Amino acid sequence: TPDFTTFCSVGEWLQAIKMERYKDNFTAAGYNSLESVARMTIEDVMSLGITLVGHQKKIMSSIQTMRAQML
């Protein structure tokens, strides 16, 4: 099992999954910790204005693996 608890920031996590284009989206909505990111549902993701389905799925998938080890 990879360890998904080793990121030191939301920005570092996004970079690792090639999603760093949404960095400002996460920041602007006050997702400043990975703890808060790990609690997100699809609705939270949609609220960020992330609209490509492929991006929503990558992020949701990464959030899931994270939540399982983090929460």
d(CA 58, CA 52): 10
Reading the block at residue 29, the tokens are 């909505």
Lookup result for tokens 């703890």 = 35
Determine the residue type at 41: T
Torsion sign, CA atoms 48, 53, 55, 61: positive
Query: What CATH number has the domain bearing residue 42?
Result: 1.10.150.50
- Stated resolution in angstroms: 2.1
Q: Which of 35, 19, 22 is nearest to 67 (CA)?
A: 35
Residues ≥6 apart with Cβ < 8 Å to 12: none
CA-to-CA distance for 43 and 12, rounded, in angstroms?
Answer: 23
In whole angstroms, give the CA distance from residue 60 to residue 43: 10
Domain span at 37: 1-71
**Total tally of structural domains belonging to the chain:** 1
